Design a protein around this ligand. Sequence first.
Ligand SMILES: O=c1ccn([C@@H]2O[C@H](COP(=O)(O)OP(=O)(O)OP(=O)(O)O)[C@@H](O)[C@H]2O)c(=O)[nH]1
Ligand SMILES: [Mg+2]
Length: 323
Amino acid sequence: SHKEFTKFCYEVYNEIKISDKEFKEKRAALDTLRLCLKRISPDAELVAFGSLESGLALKNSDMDLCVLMDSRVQSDTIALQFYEELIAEGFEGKFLQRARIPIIKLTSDTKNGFGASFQCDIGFNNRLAIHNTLLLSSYTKLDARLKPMVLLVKHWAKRKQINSPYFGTLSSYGYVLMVLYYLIHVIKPPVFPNLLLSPLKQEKIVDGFDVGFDDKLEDIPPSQNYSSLGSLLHGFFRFYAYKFEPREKVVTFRRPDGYLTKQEKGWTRYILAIEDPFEISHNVGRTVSSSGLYRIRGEFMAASRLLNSRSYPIPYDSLFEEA
Ligand SMILES: O=c1ccn([C@@H]2O[C@H](COP(=O)(O)OP(=O)(O)OP(=O)(O)O)[C@@H](O)[C@H]2O)c(=O)[nH]1
Ligand SMILES: [Mg+2]
C-alpha cells in the first residue's frame, strides 16, 4: 500500500521545507553580500551553491557561497579585502586558510537585519561545488519526487544524530548522493537515468575533473517508475539497511551498473565509501567512523522495520523522533 505513509511524508515535507519568507530573505542577504563584493572587486562574481540553490533546503539552513574570479588574481588577497568589507558592514565571522584555500565563515549579522544567527560559508573558486549543484538541480527538475524525499531523508538523519561529519557520521550532501544512487542504479524501473553516462553527455573539464553531464532535460523521457514517495523512501531505507555492503562496495555514478569495489578504487578514511560524481578522488563519506557507520546502519534498519511493521497503527511519527 504505502498510501498513509505517503500522505504523512507530504505533511512533514510541507512543514520542514524552506518557506517563501526565508527564501526571499536569503536572496536579500545575497544581494547585500554582492554589493560589498562590488565595492572591493567589480570583476568578481558571488554565487550560491548547495541546497538553497538546488532547491533542496530545509528551514533554517546554512548558506553556501562562492566567489568566482580570474585565476591569475590571487585568492587570499581578495578574500581578506572582502572579509574586511563584510566586518565593516556589520557581519561577524572568521577569515581562515586551509593549505592554499581561503574561506570566510560568517556567523552573525548585527546591522542589515538578517539575524543574530545568520550562517554562511564563502569559498573562493570552488567551481566543482557549483557543478555538483547544477547536477542535483537538474535531477530536481526531472522528477518531482526527488525534493520531498531528500528533505525527509535529511530531516531523518538530523533527528537521528547521524548527520554530523565532525562527529563520525555523514554530511547532508552524502545523503543526497545515497538517495540519487538509489534512484538511478538500484530501484527498478529506474527513477532517473545516469546523466554523466548518457550518450548525449559532452565532456567538460574543470580543475582537472570532467563535470560534463546531459543537461538537455526537456528531451529526457519521464520515469517509468510509478512508486509513491512512501514506497520510494521505504525502498531506500531497505536497500541501505540490508542489501548495500559498506565494507566492500562504493556508492558511484561512474558505472553503467553502479558496481564498484573499494579495491578497484584503492579505498581499503574509507569505512563508508561514496565517490563524488565529479571529484572522483574525493570520498564524500570519509568523515564516517566505525561507530558512526554502526549507528547509520542501525537507523536504516530501524526505519525499515518501522515501515515493515505489522503492528497497527504504525507510529510513523517515530521516524522523525530524536534518538
Ligand atoms: O563533500 C562535499 C560536501 C559538500 N559539497 C558541496 O557543498 C554543498 C553543501 O554541503 P552540505 O553538506 O551543507 O549540503 P546541504 O546544503 O544539502 O546540507 P544542509 O546544509 O542543508 O544541512 C553541497 O551541496 C555541495 O555543493 C561538496 O561538493 N562535497
Ligand atoms: Mg549547506
